[PDB]
Amino acid sequence: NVFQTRAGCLIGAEHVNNSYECDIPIGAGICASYQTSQSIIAYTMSLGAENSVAYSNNSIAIPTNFTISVTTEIL
């Protein structure tokens, strides 16, 4: 119920061992979010699903299909 972070003294949020994308920034890498009866949790944000590319000295990966995305950029 009372977490102590490298940013300060968080009061009213459980400190989970999990790791999700940063929803509400706090500091020092801690991010809080409202999740499962539910409550407010404060975790150590994760940077993305780790991934080990099957590198070799003779293996190449080539696409066969393509997708035409259309993104937006506002200025």
């Binding site: 500091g27 020092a28 940077l47 080990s52 099957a54």
Partner: protein, 312 residues
């Protein structure tokens, strides 16, 4: 340079530290505190936005394979090693070459140095194992020798030049990395750019604090001292002078910070461009990626900033 230090300055505890009379006087000047606090918070958030834009450009967190069959190139001086701060060697050399009473809180950066190191290790593993493709979509592995073949063929040098000289190119690249290691390890005036930012902000804070010991034409630079030595019918005037003075000093500091933060954001957008065009791909903009024809680049973190190794 990529980010300043997220500093916040409570106007009130600065100008009128622990003096109710002083605070109630200050209220007559209106919303200056709200304005300065909002400005410094704008800067303090823009910093985390800067680091986010510079480093967090990779969707996943790649990892080199344990084996090291890279056609003869040697990345051990830049890939992480678990034996520390899971940073790499040159990141260490960089981290070593770089070296409170009045509301001057210093917020912490949202991304802590370990997470920065993880981002840069991710970008480096992606570039090593997958070429540029990991910046265009799904990472596709490809033997490093062939990747340098493509990088060559990109600058108008047919592949057989690389394949026939693979060992010579490997030796040159390894020795060049070594020379970088030495150049950093011996002289430190190469990192003048980051150190200059840190020193500029340190001196700005020190000037802000040493302005507290000035009278601005009042009796004594201490508030409680003026409250005691006189009566409110004159402590009001003396205070009002001190408040005017300290407020002017605070606005001058915040304007310095606004301008310096605009400049650092300029360098951060430039670094983001340089990483997106110079790491995640091979560029053809002359001198944009180190003097010479450009082959690739590898990033390395550094305290409040990034450091590229333009392999050309």
């Amino acid at each position: 340079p990529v980010s300043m230090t997220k500093t916040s300055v409570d106007c009130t505890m600065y100008i009128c530290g622990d003096s109710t009379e002083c605070s109630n006087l200050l209220l007559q000047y209106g919303s200056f505190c709200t304005q300065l606090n909002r400005a410094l918070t704008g800067i303090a958030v823009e910093q985390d936005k800067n680091t986010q834009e510079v480093f967090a450009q990779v969707k996943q967190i790649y990892k080199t394979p344990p084996i090291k069959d890279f056609g003869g190139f040697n990345f051990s001086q830049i890939l992480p090693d678990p034996s520390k701060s899971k940073r790499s060697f040159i990141e260490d050399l960089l981290f070593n070459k770089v070296t409170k009473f009045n509301g001057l809180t210093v917020l912490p950066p949202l991304l802590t140095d370990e997470m920065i190191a993880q981002y840069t290790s991710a970008l480096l593993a992606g570039t090593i194992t997958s070429g540029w493709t990991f910046g265009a979509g799904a990472a596709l592995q490809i033997p490093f020798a062939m990747q340098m073949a493509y990088r060559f063929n990109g600058i108008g040098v047919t592949q057989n030049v690389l394949y026939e000289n693979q060992k010579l190119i490997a030796n040159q690249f390894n020795s060049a990395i070594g020379k970088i290691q030495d150049s950093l390890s011996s002289t430190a005036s190469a990192l003048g750019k980051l150190q200059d930012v840190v020193n500029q902000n340190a001196q700005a804070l020190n000037t802000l604090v040493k302005q507290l010991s000035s009278n601005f034409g009042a009796i004594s630079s201490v508030l409680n001292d003026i409250l005691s030595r006189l009566d409110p019918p004159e402590a009001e005037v003396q205070i009002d002078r001190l408040i005017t003075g300290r407020l002017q000093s605070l606005q001058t500091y915040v304007t310095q910070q606004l301008i310096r933060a605009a400049e650092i954001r300029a360098s951060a957008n430039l670094a983001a461009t340089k990483m997106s065009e110079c790491v995640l791909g091979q560029s053809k903009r002359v001198d944009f990626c180190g003097k010479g024809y450009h082959l690739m680049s590898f990033p390395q973190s550094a305290p409040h900033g990034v450091v590229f190794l333009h392999v050309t």
